Design a binder for this molecule. Sequence first.
Ligand SMILES: CC(=O)c1cccc(NC(=O)N2CCOCC2)c1
Length: 435
Amino acid sequence: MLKKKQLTVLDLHPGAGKTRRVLPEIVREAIKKRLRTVILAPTRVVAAEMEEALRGLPVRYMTTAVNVTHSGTEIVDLMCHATFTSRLLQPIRVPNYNLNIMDEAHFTDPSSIAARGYISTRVEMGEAAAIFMTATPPGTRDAFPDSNSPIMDTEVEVPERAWSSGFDWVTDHSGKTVWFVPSVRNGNEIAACLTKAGKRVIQLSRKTFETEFQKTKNQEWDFVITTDISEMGANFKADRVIDSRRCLKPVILDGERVILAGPMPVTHASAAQRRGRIGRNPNKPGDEYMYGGGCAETDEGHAHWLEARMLLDNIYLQDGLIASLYRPEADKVAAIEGEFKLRTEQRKTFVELMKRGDLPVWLAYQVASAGITYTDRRWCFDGTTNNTIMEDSVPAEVWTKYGEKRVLKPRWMDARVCSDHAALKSFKEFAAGKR
Ligand SMILES: CC(=O)c1cccc(NC(=O)N2CCOCC2)c1
């Protein structure tokens, strides 16, 4: 695998040992061959699991998720997918790694897609080797891959709202269930219904994942209600997955606004990763996968691939050259390589709106490309009446940095800034000048 100009897809089935058995063998061989190596974890939770798998090997943990005193002599670096892309975008030297290892390489967040595009372009240039570790590479069509033990697959109507009757099988179960929902708001309603029925529920989403995931180890629970973030190498001691088989799709309308379309079917890759949370113990056959819909290739036209192009257009590669998306995922967007390349000061603004502003890539791009500076929040208030953000069926209001109460009416509307109470709270703080 370790030869320059090689990209290997390590596509062993979920639970086959890619992280705990194969990765340490790859790292030992890379160190023997003096390959400057990066290992990319999708989440801080996976970063910590990797430290355990790699313990004693000379690896530099570029993450506060691990508390280890480093020698200063490591040639292997470990960081999150997002950290890799972030450092490429910033005016910081990222080593030209000889070997690029991406764990949970199916991750479809924009920074992960961009990282794959940059890495696969360096490999195509003859500059580097790469290993993408995933059971479900891009365009996989198999929702039911092999497992460590047999899975009971059942197509069944799955509730997406509170229920009073007609789903006894949900609550009649005595084991532990991981339940994939399409949104935080949908999980909140199901979680409340289960809580009312006497169940112990933990909810996981991107913003809460590290903190709340620890509760799955520290407390007894009956259900984990999770969004798609638990597709990325989250492991549970569970005997059932309930899968809505639904997700939200960010869609850019008319180059002008982003909506969260759906819920709509998941991809085959997502369905396989959701299912792959169970059947992992060869000694515990008959784990259950209850699924409530079909699969479809809903990554086609999904904003994350256009956002990945916005990131890659703003990463230096060589002179004016621009990294391509990884070939198998390159048709998911209609985009011209370089169309989103920003001049130096607008690029800095773009980066800060993502890094400090915590804005979605698309929205950060609209603001930066309009020639607005990072601290200028006038655009949060001067949109059309139809861009009014609503909070409990009334227009959201904030005090501006000038001390004026105004309706939140952003010039560019991206549904991700108000997808749930926590998102809208964060965006209100942004509009107010509080970060
Ligand atoms: C984003 C982030 O957390 C980050 C970013 C850059 C560097 C590091 N830390 C290191 O380079 N390590 C670990 C600490 O002490 C020895 C060297 C962490």
